[PDB]
Amino acid sequence: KGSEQESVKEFLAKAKEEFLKKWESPSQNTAQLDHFDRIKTLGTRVMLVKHKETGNHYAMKILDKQKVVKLKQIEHTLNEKRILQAVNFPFLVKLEFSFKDNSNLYMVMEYVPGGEMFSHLRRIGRFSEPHARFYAAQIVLTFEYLHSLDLIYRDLKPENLLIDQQGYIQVTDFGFAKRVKGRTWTLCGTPEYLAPEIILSKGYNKAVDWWALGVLIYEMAAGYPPFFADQPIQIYEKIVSGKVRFPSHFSSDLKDLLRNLLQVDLTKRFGNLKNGVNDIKNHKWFATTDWIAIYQRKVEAPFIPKFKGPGDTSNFDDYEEEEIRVSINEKCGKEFTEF
Amino acid sequence: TTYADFIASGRTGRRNAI
Ligand SMILES: c1ccc2cnccc2c1
Predict the structure, then answer these.
(1) Domain shared by A328 and A279, yes or no
(2) How many angstroms separate the CA atoms of A98 and A111, rounded?
(3) Fewer CB atoms inside 10 Å of the end CB: C or N, chain B?
(4) Which domain does A20 fall in, by range?
(5) Contact B6 A229 (CB under 8 A)
(6) Rounded to 5 degrees, what are φ and ψ at A27?
(7) A104 touches A325 (CB < 8 A)
(8) Which residues of A touch B18 (CB under 8 A)?
(9) How many domains does one find in chain A?
């Protein structure tokens, strides 16, 4: 616990004062639908839109209130918007506006044009270890930030990590993020990325994010996840078994880090010991990482996405376009009153 | 190879939350 650790501590203290102000007094109803021209679907929904008054492009997430109710996601959706409007960190996508109408909820975020990490990783096959380390370091700092605010993220995966014009990561989709000081119990996440304590229906805490980091680093460096199969149940059987196999090109340092992150024993999992995140940040695999330089975006990125111009979506897949219908009757008003 | 097994599997596309 030296001078560098005290500075992190003080930085996180100021970050928490700012977060809590917005957490306790959330912003609400800061734009309306006809402020935007709708361009194209970016994921399924999230749409590219253009703000008329400024000409800025944004990514607008649209949720059908009736479908949220049927899927029992009311409280998770209130979590997502309340957390997103309160956070502020370089590697988190920024929420610029939110609002609702008779049918839908809307979250309008900064447009990140470089595409999902998922698309680049699948196309290239795998990332080199320096490449994967660059991205992993950003997730390490982002979880240090989120966890210090008593937030658990619970859906880390390449599909949710966007590459910006500087080649850095922006985390999107807070649909399962939750502020909780005790343990929690919800069965949620993506199968390949679930910690064993989730699968086995135990109480669990922020250590599930550090397990998921282990899955992410493995998938970036290997090109495939550490546990995969054609059916989710078969994936879960592999996750709880306690064994992991590594590609032969994995360095010795990388395997040792992943055995400590993909650790079924919670009393032994990195990120969850007395030293907290510093067991990770001081691991030999991260010896060349300058954490301050990463935070300041001063490190040279592995690649810069192709940019054809404003509003171009060539780094995203194409999706079938569907109408945005707004009923003449208010749906689910009481359930979403605080949104 | 494990890569070949992954590429021929049904879970190389985007994965939905549970
Ligand atoms: C999903 C898909 C594309 C995105 C692009 N920019 C911001 C957020 C996004 C979410």
Answers:
(1) no
(2) 15
(3) N
(4) 1-25+116-306
(5) no
(6) -80, 155
(7) no
(8) 187-191, 194, 232
(9) 2
